[PDB]
């Protein structure tokens, strides 16, 4: 869709302005921490299965009404549905982190997601909790602060990208809220 | 739009899979080519209405017939429209120099160009004359660096091929 | 509870300091915008019913799981509890607006509110949505120029939006 | 007519003359798709009888076109070769689309736009996106109906989904590309008594697909979901949100004041002095038509409601930005000679000489003065 | 769809009445000026490209806000869109003039055209002007008083058909209003 | 009972009625750029669209008045209480007079065929009786918003 | 109480009031080309537009004075302190008198119907009482900027 380089040309196209050296240094900074974003996306997608299975089970074990009959995560088919319903969310947040802006998950994954879960009868505040656990796991991973498994990195700062993946995860919260 | 990143995310999305190792392998190619194309972009940007002045007139030098009555250039305001028409193409080439792909060229100048210029009697030969005159006037040593002129000319002759 | 004058008075007392002249400069410019401060709380107060009712109406138009059967606003008494919960926050934000700081908002409105909603099973994120829907409704109304002299009051509008933000993150 | 066993006519790709007809039908898509366990099974050419393979074609690619025995001999000439094994069901549903009996109620009876939606619903089982219609009206109006119906059958979506031996049907695919193309598909395909013939226009997805924003209503895309995927929600709660919908789905109620072009009008109390709310913003629409006749010229008048246009207003705000950043005026102590807004103000005089004496009129009004940029 | 001969049978079918010699003379008059309608449709479709390109450029050169960025006819793709958006209108008015009544463009072209232009953001009053210019060009052509190019005809009256194509062109104005 | 000149005069308005409102509201801003300012009354498309609609209403209301040849319908369902709803909505009463006078100056230029951008094709004559009558109608509507 | 001649006299000004300002400012440049010069006061459209507006103001201010038949409104919200704001803006005080006298010489030509480019259609008579009164009004405004 739109990446971070293509975000500034649609802003400059609105004024018929050439992209010049007054706003190019914000792009060159974005290129300068290319390897930091690149290793961070890799650290997200490396341990992504436990990322999903842990988050859905953590959403279950705080609200055990879904396991009761009449729950939305009651039967075996609906649990298989919910385990992928959040894996798609993680799969699109991994796209948005790599692309540099939240345009690829906005119209592809988030457009029409609200009335889908309304018409199906999916409890929205439970999905809020399920994606907040995924946000917490994401900032644990890309800051290398997971107490559960450590990955090797070159030393430095990564919080600028950690706030980015946090700002992607509230958009998934706002769109079904 | 059609950039380097927006093929590797759309391919992984149509396959329905995570960003794999070859997918982040292709964004590394931006780090080596952006240093060549961004400096081409604002050497284009800081010199831009010069290369409409000294190159939008070359079509009128090649095709002086269209200043006749009953032609595409009748009065001065249509010539101003012509200079505006070619300044737009020079802006879109600058947009494609910064994006990394030919994304901003496709749906903003190229898609639909065959219809308008046929219906409004505008000859595409006078467009590609003015673009080609801007293409061959490039010299690595001056104008820009050795690698800036390469894909600066490559984004130009893409437009030349698409208009013809 | 403290207002903005009593706050730096407590600051200066707890180190035994006389108030410097520069702090008297800081208090006189709060005195300077007194009519503009009063002008806002007046506009919020005369529109308080339509703020709460329109924000609540727009909340269930986009979160229809609350008013459908089983939701946490499916009664007439849980619904009347929700409207009156929204009026409470609009009341205490307007108290903090004339106080100058958020002591009375934090102290006797937001203290223990997250735990209350967790004990009741009320979804606090949907409360946070309704608070920001009242926030933009009151902010766009505080930039209305009818009945006021022509001037600048934008920093006070940002201060008013800050209290709604503080109440919004306090209940999630 | 052409071959006793054929694979693919017209040789669009070169690699179809080598391509043999599939000996066994294409399997399910490899995603998991939780709805599919509720939906009835697919109907291929191998498993079906010739009675039910005809019934299922009439139920999917025709909607419920409601066909008699005397109607449509041309469908049955194509059926006379399908039943002989001459052509696949892929080329058979291509031949149904090219037929006149499909034209006379879907290309003919409908409009330019929802014929494309009726083609997507009939052949691919789903609803298109706006950029997919955008490259499709060019095929339809400038290259004709034939290439348009050809563009579905030679498409990769059709080949991958139905193959050469399975009837079209609505497919639940698990992972979808957009999240909106799930419920657009569900909205486009309700269950029994579909009746594409009924609504001359449907007017609802024809404005929801007409822009990438403005996703359609919750209740329309949760209505034809199967039972026990949506029951225990349809006793009394959304039931009156459903019948009040289907009343408006009759007669094709237009969504001009609903979901698109929404405008919060001012309170009625602010204009009680002017007029009643049933007549506010109506204005006479005058069409004066010249022709050199006197027998045949005409004038028409009608009061019409004039909606505010947010598209034209957005363009005007972008244009007037140039005046915002060019200063207003210099000032000084000499402003006391111009006390009010009377800076650069002047009296405008208009003098109305006419043939009648009673209709003569004199003006004076005080107003600002500015010179246009063309002078 | 419905032509002029088929318009009277759906009126007589509403009363179960035979079409008889009391209303047949209005049909025989319509047959009598068959060649006048026939040459008029030919004179419309002969010069139809300048008819479209002149009208859209005349709509542009009175309202030059569409050419500004943010205009609906700003870019090259949208101008290619608008040049055909009115060519379809002329193409259906040519059908309605030949068929003798405004039934073929009402459900085929005009049904659903309003919310299409509303949902896309097409300025309706500009399209009103664009089709009014086409109406003026039409009455210029089929009365043979185009000062710009003259066509040869047999002498006589054609204003009865000129009011017809005028009444077709306000239906395209009313359906978009 | 002026037949043909009246019908030629309304045709010079209702055809080019689409320029006249957009030229007048841009001219309305052209004096006063504090109207599009944050806090102004010609802020975002909630209000700019109602401005275009309102400039169009009072334009047309005059063409039917000119077609009828009298100012009756300009006071029946047009004007009896248009001032107080405008002061209830809080529109600026100053620049509305300017917007009305741009319409006057443009209508009197269209009727007399003295437009620099478009020369109309009329029968030979002089429309001096009708160029002042639309000025009288526009002052009738300008006297209301005052 | 001169009724019809006064109304004929103002009509000969406010109709052709658009030529008179543009002819006068071109005549203002006509002897003094150092005004459009780089460094002059009639440089780019920041200042030339204010010149056209200001030449229009003092033109009209006289037609309402002539309609009222006295110079009261030419001194109330017109003139009491117009000299010092002009010396505060730094306009040349010389060529403004020339611009005012071109308006005088043109108004006295329009009233007496002695224009070489346009012959007006009046009732038979002689407007000698009004041709001098507008000269007295223009003198009043010329005595101010001195
Ligand atoms: C928009 C409506 C949201 C909502 C509201 C809701 N609240 C309650 C219950 C309580 N709310 C409070 C909160 C306060 N009480 C106070 O005195 C103050 C002043 C500082 C506050 C902020 C308390 C104590 C309760 C419990 C007491 C009670 O029962 O009223 C309820 C439930 C009422 C009930 O269960 O009977 C609702 C529904 N809930 C929503 O879903 C909306 C998001
Ligand atoms: C492109 C983006 C994209 C998505 C985001 C998903 C969104 C999505 N989820 C479901 C469908 C579902 N999604 C859930 C998920 C949940 N319910 C809960 O109780 C939990 C809160 C949550 C899991 C964590 C369940 C349980 C169903 C099946 C509902 C049912 O049939 O019982 C469906 C219907 C299709 C089907 O049922 O097979 C769709 C489109 N699919 C997509 O194509
Ligand atoms: C975003 C990308 C973008 C573009 C590339 C241009 C493309 C473009 N050019 C024109 C329009 C035009 N383009 C030209 C240009 C030329 N004719 C000639 O004689 C020469 C061959 C050539 C200049 C060298 C002229 C003269 C017109 C006006 C034609 C007319 O109005 O009849 C139009 C129609 C709208 C208009 O009149 O402005 C469009 C869409 N506009 C865009 O928005
Ligand atoms: C970003 C794109 C870009 C361009 C293509 C040029 C375009 C351009 N070139 C020249 C001007 C020139 N261009 C050349 C050409 C060359 N000079 C050499 O040393 C090489 C041998 C050869 C590289 C092609 C020469 C010799 C002149 C000077 C004489 C002339 O005007 O032709 C001029 C006139 C004044 C000037 O030098 O600027 C302009 C506008 N400028 C730009 O900003
Ligand atoms: C009875 C209760 C009571 C009130 C409600 C206030 C209201 C009030 N405000 C102002 C005066 C003012 N009020 C405002 C406020 C605003 N103006 C705007 O244009 C914005 C819409 C809004 C900003 C929030 C401003 C900005 C001034 C000063 C005028 C200026 O300098 O712009 C004045 C005149 C005195 C002065 O000059 O300060 C009064 C009496 N005072 C009271 O005693
Ligand atoms: C799966 C369940 C299922 C059904 C129940 C029917 C329902 C149904 N009936 C009709 C269509 C119709 N149904 C009727 C029937 C009647 N009108 C009357 O005046 C009587 C009250 C009643 C007969 C007793 C008529 C007359 C039409 C055709 C309407 C017309 O075109 O005039 C259509 C439109 C399709 C078409 O017209 O071919 C459909 C879907 N079809 C189904 O697939
Ligand atoms: C476009 C041109 C066109 C045609 C000419 C026919 C040709 C044709 N006929 C049959 C099919 C047939 N045709 C016949 C006809 C006959 N057998 C006899 O003994 C008699 C000599 C003769 C009748 C006079 C019979 C009996 C069958 C069916 C064979 C069977 O199943 O027993 C089939 C197979 C399709 C089906 O069986 O439904 C086709 C394609 N169809 C076409 O579409
Ligand atoms: C069967 C009948 C039939 C029609 C009448 C047209 C109607 C029509 N027009 C457009 C689409 C359009 N139509 C216009 C036209 C205009 N906008 C303006 O500013 C001018 C007023 C006007 C030209 C004179 C434009 C500019 C678009 C594209 C909008 C955009 O993407 O920017 C679309 C969307 C499809 C697409 O964008 O490709 C459709 C269905 N098509 C049909 O099939
Ligand atoms: C709805 C149908 C309809 C019309 C549009 C008008 C068109 C029209 N006007 C006139 C005829 C005329 N029309 C005008 C009008 C004008 N002359 C000018 O120079 C000005 C531009 C304009 C005044 C604003 C004049 C002055 C005459 C001649 C006197 C007269 O017949 O009234 C005639 C008689 C023949 C002719 O001269 O062409 C016709 C048909 N009349 C109609 O029945
Ligand atoms: C930036 C500030 C700004 C303004 C002050 C106005 C500029 C403006 N132009 C006209 C004047 C006019 N406006 C039109 C209207 C049109 N001409 C046409 O041919 C089209 C059909 C139609 C839409 C453009 C006409 C015909 C005139 C009279 C001729 C002229 O003065 O150009 C007038 C009224 C007479 C006058 O006092 O000059 C004004 C105020 N527009 C602005 O943007
Ligand atoms: C029969 C005669 C008739 C009219 C004249 C209009 C009059 C009119 N205007 C508005 C209402 C309005 N009209 C305007 C328009 C403007 N405000 C300004 O400062 C400028 C003068 C102008 C833009 C240039 C605005 C801004 C609103 C109010 C929109 C709002 O803020 O609620 C309303 C309230 C209803 C509504 O808009 O929803 C009415 C009835 N309507 C009619 O039926
Ligand atoms: C607003 C409406 C209105 C007007 C425009 C004037 C128009 C006007 N002037 C006069 C009548 C006259 N008008 C003039 C004026 C002049 N004669 C000249 O040669 C000079 C050109 C000009 C002086 C500058 C004279 C001298 C008379 C005759 C004496 C008189 O009645 O005053 C009459 C009476 C009948 C007639 O003679 O036509 C009328 C209606 N009066 C009005 O009520
Ligand atoms: C290059 C230097 C330059 C100038 C010195 C002035 C030239 C000029 N012309 C007139 C004089 C005039 N100017 C007009 C005005 C007009 N005539 C009309 O018919 C139109 C309606 C209107 C706008 C053209 C009239 C009516 C006269 C008096 C008749 C005449 O002397 O031509 C006067 C005043 C009398 C005089 O002293 O001659 C001057 C100074 N213009 C210049 O460009
Ligand atoms: C009620 C009576 C009344 C007037 C007479 C005018 C008077 C007037 N003129 C100017 C202001 C001005 N007026 C002029 C005009 C000129 N300078 C010259 O050298 C020439 C004499 C003339 C052009 C031919 C210029 C150049 C400015 C100042 C513009 C600037 O540089 O800031 C200003 C300052 C406000 C502003 O323009 O923004 C005012 C109030 N306005 C009124 O309200």
PDB file of N, CA and C in Angstrom, chain G residues 59-81:
ATOM      1  N   UNK G  59     -13.773  58.386  -5.447  1.00  0.00           N
ATOM      2  CA  UNK G  59     -14.724  58.598  -6.526  1.00  0.00           C
ATOM      3  C   UNK G  59     -16.144  58.498  -6.008  1.00  0.00           C
ATOM      4  N   UNK G  60     -16.486  57.351  -5.432  1.00  0.00           N
ATOM      5  CA  UNK G  60     -17.827  57.118  -4.898  1.00  0.00           C
ATOM      6  C   UNK G  60     -18.240  58.101  -3.798  1.00  0.00           C
ATOM      7  N   UNK G  61     -17.319  58.399  -2.885  1.00  0.00           N
ATOM      8  CA  UNK G  61     -17.591  59.316  -1.776  1.00  0.00           C
ATOM      9  C   UNK G  61     -18.177  60.642  -2.256  1.00  0.00           C
ATOM     10  N   UNK G  62     -17.976  60.927  -3.537  1.00  0.00           N
ATOM     11  CA  UNK G  62     -18.470  62.143  -4.170  1.00  0.00           C
ATOM     12  C   UNK G  62     -19.860  61.928  -4.759  1.00  0.00           C
ATOM     13  N   UNK G  63     -20.151  60.721  -5.247  1.00  0.00           N
ATOM     14  CA  UNK G  63     -21.481  60.472  -5.790  1.00  0.00           C
ATOM     15  C   UNK G  63     -22.555  60.448  -4.714  1.00  0.00           C
ATOM     16  N   UNK G  64     -22.247  59.939  -3.520  1.00  0.00           N
ATOM     17  CA  UNK G  64     -23.206  60.057  -2.429  1.00  0.00           C
ATOM     18  C   UNK G  64     -23.311  61.491  -1.941  1.00  0.00           C
ATOM     19  N   UNK G  65     -22.205  62.240  -1.984  1.00  0.00           N
ATOM     20  CA  UNK G  65     -22.264  63.666  -1.686  1.00  0.00           C
ATOM     21  C   UNK G  65     -23.122  64.434  -2.682  1.00  0.00           C
ATOM     22  N   UNK G  66     -23.131  64.005  -3.940  1.00  0.00           N
ATOM     23  CA  UNK G  66     -23.925  64.673  -4.961  1.00  0.00           C
ATOM     24  C   UNK G  66     -25.385  64.257  -4.874  1.00  0.00           C
ATOM     25  N   UNK G  67     -25.636  62.983  -4.568  1.00  0.00           N
ATOM     26  CA  UNK G  67     -26.985  62.504  -4.302  1.00  0.00           C
ATOM     27  C   UNK G  67     -27.612  63.207  -3.110  1.00  0.00           C
ATOM     28  N   UNK G  68     -26.862  63.361  -2.023  1.00  0.00           N
ATOM     29  CA  UNK G  68     -27.348  64.136  -0.894  1.00  0.00           C
ATOM     30  C   UNK G  68     -27.335  65.630  -1.178  1.00  0.00           C
ATOM     31  N   UNK G  69     -26.532  66.074  -2.138  1.00  0.00           N
ATOM     32  CA  UNK G  69     -26.510  67.463  -2.530  1.00  0.00           C
ATOM     33  C   UNK G  69     -25.705  68.372  -1.637  1.00  0.00           C
ATOM     34  N   UNK G  70     -24.959  67.825  -0.683  1.00  0.00           N
ATOM     35  CA  UNK G  70     -24.150  68.637   0.209  1.00  0.00           C
ATOM     36  C   UNK G  70     -22.897  67.864   0.581  1.00  0.00           C
ATOM     37  N   UNK G  71     -21.901  68.596   1.075  1.00  0.00           N
ATOM     38  CA  UNK G  71     -20.658  68.002   1.557  1.00  0.00           C
ATOM     39  C   UNK G  71     -20.699  67.947   3.080  1.00  0.00           C
ATOM     40  N   UNK G  72     -21.431  66.965   3.591  1.00  0.00           N
ATOM     41  CA  UNK G  72     -21.356  66.588   4.993  1.00  0.00           C
ATOM     42  C   UNK G  72     -20.670  65.238   5.140  1.00  0.00           C
ATOM     43  N   UNK G  73     -21.140  64.237   4.392  1.00  0.00           N
ATOM     44  CA  UNK G  73     -20.580  62.892   4.417  1.00  0.00           C
ATOM     45  C   UNK G  73     -19.191  62.819   3.802  1.00  0.00           C
ATOM     46  N   UNK G  74     -18.765  63.863   3.097  1.00  0.00           N
ATOM     47  CA  UNK G  74     -17.402  63.939   2.602  1.00  0.00           C
ATOM     48  C   UNK G  74     -16.420  64.393   3.673  1.00  0.00           C
ATOM     49  N   UNK G  75     -16.877  64.609   4.909  1.00  0.00           N
ATOM     50  CA  UNK G  75     -16.010  65.089   5.976  1.00  0.00           C
ATOM     51  C   UNK G  75     -16.250  64.309   7.264  1.00  0.00           C
ATOM     52  N   UNK G  76     -17.318  63.513   7.364  1.00  0.00           N
ATOM     53  CA  UNK G  76     -17.539  62.745   8.587  1.00  0.00           C
ATOM     54  C   UNK G  76     -16.761  61.432   8.660  1.00  0.00           C
ATOM     55  N   UNK G  77     -17.107  60.444   7.838  1.00  0.00           N
ATOM     56  CA  UNK G  77     -16.322  59.217   7.785  1.00  0.00           C
ATOM     57  C   UNK G  77     -15.568  59.134   6.468  1.00  0.00           C
ATOM     58  N   UNK G  78     -15.081  60.275   5.998  1.00  0.00           N
ATOM     59  CA  UNK G  78     -14.313  60.346   4.764  1.00  0.00           C
ATOM     60  C   UNK G  78     -12.926  60.932   4.943  1.00  0.00           C
ATOM     61  N   UNK G  79     -12.812  62.059   5.637  1.00  0.00           N
ATOM     62  CA  UNK G  79     -11.693  62.949   5.384  1.00  0.00           C
ATOM     63  C   UNK G  79     -10.999  63.491   6.623  1.00  0.00           C
ATOM     64  N   UNK G  80     -11.598  63.407   7.814  1.00  0.00           N
ATOM     65  CA  UNK G  80     -11.035  64.036   9.009  1.00  0.00           C
ATOM     66  C   UNK G  80      -9.805  63.251   9.462  1.00  0.00           C
ATOM     67  N   UNK G  81      -8.685  63.538   8.807  1.00  0.00           N
ATOM     68  CA  UNK G  81      -7.435  62.874   9.116  1.00  0.00           C
ATOM     69  C   UNK G  81      -6.968  61.911   8.046  1.00  0.00           C
TER      70      UNK G  81
END
